[PDB]
Every structure is written in structure tokens, then in C-alpha cells.
Amino acid sequence: MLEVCIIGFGFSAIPLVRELARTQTEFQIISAESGSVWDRLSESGRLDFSLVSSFQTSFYSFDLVRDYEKDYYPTAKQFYEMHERWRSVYEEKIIRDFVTKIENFKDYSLISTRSGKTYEAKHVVLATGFDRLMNTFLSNFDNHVSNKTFVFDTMGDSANLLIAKLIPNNNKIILRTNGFTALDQEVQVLGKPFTLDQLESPNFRYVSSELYDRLMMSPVYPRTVNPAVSYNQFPLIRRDFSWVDSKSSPPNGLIAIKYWPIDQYYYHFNDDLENYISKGYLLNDIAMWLHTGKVILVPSDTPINFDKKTITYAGIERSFHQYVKGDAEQPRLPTILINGETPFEYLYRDTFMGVIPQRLNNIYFLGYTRPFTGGLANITEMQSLFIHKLITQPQFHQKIHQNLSKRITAYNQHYYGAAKPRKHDHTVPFGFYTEDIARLIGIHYQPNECRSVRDLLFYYAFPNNAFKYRLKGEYAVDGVDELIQKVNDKHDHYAQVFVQALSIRNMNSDEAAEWDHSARRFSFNDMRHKEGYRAFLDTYLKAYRQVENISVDDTVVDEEWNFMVKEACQVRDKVAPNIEEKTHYSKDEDVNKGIRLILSILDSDISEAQSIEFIRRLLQPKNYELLFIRES
Ligand SMILES: Cc1cc2nc3c(=O)[nH]c(=O)nc-3n(C[C@H](O)[C@H](O)[C@H](O)COP(=O)(O)OP(=O)(O)OC[C@H]3O[C@@H](n4cnc5c(N)ncnc54)[C@H](O)[C@@H]3O)c2cc1C
Ligand SMILES: N[C@@H](Cc1c[nH]c2ccccc12)C(=O)O
């Protein structure tokens, strides 16, 4: 009888199928003829956008070792073409059918399909993706609508893309909001560009969770009074974070939108705008929309008349063309019967690492963990190794399952505290998840085995991408050595991120907050770098309309709209004039001097002197314990 049956083949299943093939483990795939959202967009000519995740976190290690030459954000078209490439490789192992039920028994599961053919398999892996009504809404969007008003009740990456397609046709956008977290998907470090996933250095949580909190959360929590940051100019973007009860930050369950800042979009695309726009690189700078009044934030209880399609704000009954509210993504799971009898209910927090449900036997979930930043590939590549190791090695299967409920309890205590399960529990920081899985599999690194300072840069500062853990050991991929070499050379061995931690080692969280925003351009939501691109924004809108073959009238200054903009930006108009011109930009000075210190001792063996003390203390970090990794 079959050893492994995989249900669903799109993107998440790729690395697991690759490993089962290499161990020549018997397996079968069943995926529906229907296809994915990527197929639907392909079939309607709608793959004209880009990923919000960098290439090095969005493509699998066995592609990166062949294809990586620089950091960049691939297009949707590039993403899907990689999906299809791998489908052509394994299509002979795919039965085109739709799974309707799984009866889970002691040794095996009985799988049913719509064609009526049944299958028996010892191990069952589900990688079927998620449902979103927002997908159908993008597949039916008319991008030639112009001179209209739109009302949004949710803000997310899908909503942000629609706003980017609506802005150039002179459409006005109203956001009825209880706040959202937005982050520049690319930032500058002493002028040079870094995708945000490059600057997370997540293993510094092992030094101290308080130090790691100071490294990451001042752009998310309103910790600085600096009047240049968007959460001071537009306080309706602030969310109610009272649910957070973990000492691990960024907390599991936090989601952010990643967007092109206009200064970085200009840097990359201004010399060939019409071509870049047509390739899928669209300007989606929400901070620029608020700055210019093209998007306004209004209180979440602003009244809407759905009968008349009006919304009333600033004393104005504003008629609107369309109202938009996105649904909750739910996973696409078939009916699963505990013991062939009891319906199973999915709950992310009641599974181990989002993969192992504790009510079932030999059933695994692949692709249902979401990364807080970067691509899903980092997550699904590590999940695939975990799953493959579970399927093919009984000693590991037993070592994990013998205390499964206790591992889940300790995991949840660490990352959720006493919070009730939330809809977004499945979102995790990618460098915590890949490192968590690595330590479970045993392909992690050990902080105490670093010899030189260059070793400490790799352990702590080099991003915890899946390929980081595939240089040596059980899941080693050929070519990973040159890839890490390329990445280090191209990012100066990540000395810049390492120096950030050193600069804040003795600050409290408010000192750290103001230090983050003392740079000439701080990483995220710097409102000082918007007005200077007003001219370019007009060039962008003209070029966008040329690509879309549309004629649009911008002569009518919407006076009603201008009035509503003025009402909505009163805090901005008060705090923005407080923006200071400094003599010293403290963060820029500290990072330059810290980088020059590190590159002079890069090759020194572990043997300012207070920085020396800090660096030597990285060999035995005292917050290294993760109790869900142990077998008691
Ligand atoms: C608009 C949009 C933009 C995105 N952008 C990014 C991005 O920039 N970066 C990123 O990392 N991720 C992004 N994602 C995430 C994206 O969902 C994943 O990267 C990927 O598409 C999901 O892979 P999957 O294999 O898990 O699901 P899918 O690709 O949806 O594959 C699941 C497959 O299983 C099939 N299937 C489902 N149920 C059954 C069943 N019962 N029986 C048989 N077959 C079944 C489906 O038909 C489908 O073919 C985006 C998602 C969307 C919707
Ligand atoms: N540590 C870097 C990058 C960073 C901060 N907060 C983040 C949140 C998410 C991703 C990256 C970051 C900085 O302070 O600029």
C-alpha cells in the first residue's frame, strides 16, 4: 500500500516532492484539474503585478543556488512560471482529481475523490492552500474605471494592490479603519538598498528578547514622538495591540503590508517606467497616498448609506462608486474524520509547528504557516524537510510525537502567552520559524561553535533563509556554499545589521525608538521623503495610463474631496511643521563607525572594549532555551 499521498500541488509541495524523489520514497500526488489562483490570473491576463517578497526568500534553495545574482523582487509572472516549471517535472506523479474526504485510521487513511476512485496511504500530506473571496474580486477588476470614489473596510496586501491600480485613474480612496501596519519593502542602509528581510538578524533573540524587541518594534508600536513618522502624522493607522501577550516579538499573529517606497521605486524604475509598469512593478506607496490626500483615513464608525451609496464625513455626503471588504482566508481542507468517525476541526494553535495535528495519525499540513516578512518559500521549504524527516525516519517520528501535546503547550506558552486564539495565529516571523524547524531537525548552527568574528556575523546577522541551513548535514543542497559566498559579498557579510544590535545594547526601548528615527532616512514610513517626489508621481501616473491604454481627466480639482482631505489630515498639519533639521544624524554616524570597526576585525579570532565584551558574550547567549524543542 502507498507510503505517501500528497494532496494539492502548487508551490508549497515542490520541496517535499523533491526530497521524497531523492530518497525514492513511494508517493502519489492528487491535485485538481482546476488549478490555483495563479492559473486563474494567468487565464484572465492578470499576472501584471509583483511579489511583496524578495527573490531570496521567495524561491527555493535549489533554484537560488543556480539563479541568484542579486536581491530583487520578482514579478507575479516570474513566480508562476517557476510554479509551472516544477509542475512539468512532476506532472506524471499527479492524478488530476479532487479529494473530497479523508478517513483517518490507525495505520492508514482512506482517501475519497470526486471521480469516486479511492486510495489508501500510510502518510497523507495536505498542501491545498487557502480560500479568499478577494481573489475572485481581483479576477474581475476593471482597471479602466476613473474619477470615482472607493470605500475600503480592510487594509491588506490585496487591498494595497487594488489601490495602486485605482490611483492613476484619478480615483479617490477612503479607508474606514482601525489601523494597519505598513513597511517599506526596501530601505536604505547608508544609502544602499536592502530588502527588509535582509535586516532582521533573528538569532539575536537568543541574546535577550528585550534587546530583540528594541531592534524591531519601534516602527510597529508607537514608541517615537518623532513627528516625521507616519503613525504620528496619521494616528488612525495605529492598531489596538492589547492582545499581545508574548515575550517573543515580533509577536506571532502580527501581519504587515510591504510596499514600494516612492524613493526606492524611483531609484529602480524611473529610467524605463512604462516597461517596468507593464512587467508588474507598480507604485503602491500608501504613505505617499496619505501625504497627497489621494487616500484618506477616517474613523472606523464613519456612517455609510448603502442604499444611496454615500458616505458622510466632514459634513459632506460623499457618493461612492464601490465598497470593498475582503473576507477571511480559510484553508482549503477536505473533510477529515478522526478514526473514520469524528469530524476534525482545524486550529493552527492546536497543531505542532503548523504541521502536525494532534488528533490525527500520519497527516501533515504544508503551506498553512504564513511568514510575517518575505516569501512563503522560506516556510514551505523548511516544512517540507520536517515532513520528509517525519515520513522517512521512524526514530524521529517517535521522538516528536511521544510528547506532542507537551511540545504544543510549550510552543504556545512561548509565542502566544495567554492570548485567546486569533484568526492570524498562523503568521510567524520567518527567521524564528526556519530556525525553530532547524533546531528540531538538527540542521541548526550552534552559537558556541563560532571561532572568528566572521562566524558570529553568519550565525546572528545572516538571514535565516531556508538555504542557510542547507550548507551541511542531512538536507544539504549542492551549490549552497557559493550562494552564501555571493550573498555575503553583496551585503558586506551583514555587518550593517550586526552593528545595529551593538548600537542599542544599553538603551531602553524609548531611547532605541528615537535612535531608529534619528537617521536621515529611517527604515520605515519616513514622511520626510515624499513631497520631493510629487513631480515624479505625475510622470508615473502619465506612464501608467499609457500602459493601460486609458484616457483620464485630471482637470477637475475635486473641491469636495480637497475639503475632506483637509479634515482628515489635521494631525499631520500640526505635527509635520515640527520636523527638525539636525546637525548630527545619530543613527547614521553610529552605523558608519560601527561598520568600520567590524570590517577591521572581521577575521580576528574571538580573543571599543565594551563592544569586545558584547561580542565575546555572543558565544554563550543566555536566552537560547526553547522548551518545545526538548523531549523532557
Ligand atoms: C494575490 C496573491 C499574491 C501573493 N503574493 C505572494 C508573494 O508575493 N510572495 C509569497 O511568498 N506568497 C505570495 N502569495 C501566497 C501564495 O498563496 C503562495 O505563494 C502559493 O500560491 C500557495 O501555494 P500552495 O501550493 O500552498 O497553494 P496553491 O498554489 O493554491 O496550490 C494548491 C493546489 O491544490 C489544489 N487543491 C486544493 N484542494 C484540493 C483538493 N481537495 N484535492 C485536490 N487538489 C486540491 C488547488 O487546485 C491548487 O492547484 C500570494 C497569494 C495571492 C493570492
Ligand atoms: N532592524 C532593521 C529592520 C527592521 C526593523 N523592524 C522590522 C520589522 C520587520 C522587518 C524588518 C525590520 C531596522 O531597525 O531598520
Residue numbers in the entry: 1 to 607, 631 to 655
From the manuscript:
In contrast to the well studied two-component tryptophan halogenases, AetF is a single-component flavoprotein monooxygenase. About half of the protein forms additional structural elements containing the tryptophan binding site.
The indole binding site is completed by the side chains of Glu200 and Thr373. The NH group of indole forms a hydrogen bond to the carbonyl of Met216. The amino group of Trp forms hydrogen bonds to the side-chain O atom of Gln500 and the carbonyl groups of both Leu199 and Leu215. Trp binds such that C5 is positioned correctly for halogenation. Rotational pseudo­symmetry and pseudomerohedral twinning complicated the phasing of one structure. Explicitly searching in P212121 gave a unique solution for four molecules per asymmetric unit with TFZ values of 19.5, 39.3, 41.1 and 101.6.
